[PDB]
Ligand binder design. Structure first.
Ligand code: HEM
Ligand SMILES: Clc1cccc(-c2c[nH]cn2)c1
Ligand SMILES: Clc1cccc(-c2c[nH]cn2)c1
Ligand SMILES: Clc1cccc(-c2c[nH]cn2)c1
Ligand SMILES: Clc1cccc(-c2c[nH]cn2)c1
Length: 362
């Protein structure tokens, strides 16, 4: 599963039944309007009964989903600017322990938010489920699981990243070449999986229901100063909503290939750098370690080796195809439904253009 939390935990200790009940019933609790009441009446539950990483991750997912639902409600503008103490304090304490900002992140609602139906059959969409959804019909299963499946497909390449760096230091030309071609292959497979967005996510539902609950409170006019995590911090805090930008897997190929997505002070680089603060510390460390290694790009550029250049450009091109396909996705799932905005398209186009500018041959 690469950087997905392998076999996520589904159930918390019974001590947390009141949390788990709210998170399991978000669609009708939000629908009826009883969600904010059930949060406001929660006892303050200590996080000390969360005894292992898996349970903490489940608990962070549970509380993150509750928090998104509490802040946004039905998503029609009646927001809550203060997260009640009895959830904000354990959420922030747990988030501090996991080193993640106390907002729902990609690693919660994708990497930790899934199960196999049949434990004894492969990781296919058909054999999988999400643990939590926000609203009936929000297509959170399709959106989260397809993101997960694209991540798993790409994560197969992570197995090969050590090969790349050791082939470079041991000067193993053929090993470096087959490694780069295998990475390109995984990125190409990831693109095919990517097409399953159309199979399982309806554009209307995503844009008008799901997107609401992934929104954050950074630069957000509805929560202009952030969210007050009551009884934990006195002043409100701004945190970005969930993004696949927060997947180290989806940032690591740019780092690997010396595509400097995070270089400079432009907004695209700043965003992608910022999104690393929402990755699990191990994931963020993986990226930093790649950034410290010798440049694969420079290696390939210095060898006067057309096969090596070809293998490198196959990786770069597969990244370009993913981002071009993704731009089509964004057109269909955001731009079109929004006309029923351009800062967004310019971000993705900037990132794609940085990608294609790294091609060795035009
Ligand atoms: C309904 C389907 C999708 C929509 C509407 C969508 C939308 C967006 C948006 C609005 C952004 C800008 C940054 C942000 O706001 O988070 C973005 C960036 C990004 N998305 Fe998606 N996305 C979708 C599916 C996916 C999937 C399945 C993946 C995983 C392969 C993905 C990977 C990324 C990545 C890695 C970025 C960062 C920019 C980049 O690396 O090119 N997106 N997407
Ligand atoms: Cl609890 C927690 C976990 C991770 C990051 C932060 C944070 C960063 N900046 C302000 N708060 C807070
Ligand atoms: Cl308050 C708090 C708790 C845990 C981690 C951090 C953090 C990470 N980076 C900057 N601050 C902050
Ligand atoms: Cl939180 C979350 C979960 C799955 C995918 C995304 C995403 C895709 N593109 C931008 N964000 C965000
Ligand atoms: Cl599988 C994969 C690996 C790296 C980046 C992307 C991607 C998709 N859309 C924007 N970036 C997808």
């Amino acid at each position: 599963v690469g950087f997905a939390l392998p076999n996520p935990q589904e159930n918390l200790p019974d001590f947390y039944n009141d949390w788990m009940f709210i998170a399991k019933h978000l669609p009708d609790l939000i629908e009826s309007g009883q969600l904010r009441e059930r949060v406001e009446k929660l006892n303050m539950l200590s996080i000390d009964h969360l005894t292992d990483h898996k349970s903490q991750r489940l608990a962070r997912l549970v509380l993150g989903c509750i928090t998104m639902a509490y802040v946004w409600g039905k998503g029609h503008g009646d927001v809550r600017k203060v997260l009640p103490r009895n959830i904000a304090v354990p959420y922030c304490q747990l988030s501090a322990a996991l080193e993640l900002p106390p907002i729902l992140v990609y690693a919660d609602c994708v990497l930790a938010n899934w199960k196999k139906k049949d434990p004894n059959k492969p990781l296919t969409y058909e054999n999988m489920d999400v643990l939590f959804s926000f609203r009936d019909g929000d297509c959170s299963k399709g959106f989260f699981l397809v993101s997960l499946l694209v991540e798993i497909a790409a994560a197969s390449a992570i197995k090969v990243i050590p090969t790349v760096f050791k082939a470079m230091q041991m000067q193993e030309r053929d090993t470096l070449l087959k490694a780069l071609l295998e990475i390109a292959s995984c990125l190409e497979k990831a693109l095919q999986v990517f097409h399953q967005i159309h199979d399982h996510v309806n554009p209307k539902a995503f844009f008008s229901v799901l997107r609401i609950y992934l929104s954050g409170w950074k630069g957000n006019p509805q929560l202009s100063d952030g969210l007050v995590y009551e009884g934990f911090w006195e002043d409100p805090k701004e945190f970005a909503g969930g993004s696949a930008g927060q997947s180290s897997v989806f940032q690591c190929f740019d780092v690997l290939l010396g595509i400097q997505q995070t270089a400079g002070g432009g907004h695209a680089a700043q965003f992608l750098q910022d999104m690393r603060r929402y990755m699990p510390p191990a994931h963020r460390n993986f990226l930093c370690s790649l950034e410290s290694n010798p440049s694969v790009r420079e290696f390939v550029l210095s060898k006067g080796d057309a096969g090596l250049r070809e293998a490198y450009d196959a990786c770069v091109k597969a990244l370009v195809s993913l981002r071009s396909y993704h731009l089509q996705i964004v057109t269909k799932y955001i731009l079109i439904p929004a006309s029923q905005g351009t800062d967004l398209m310019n971000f993705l186009k900037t990132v794609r253009s940085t990608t294609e500018k790294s091609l060795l041959k035009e």
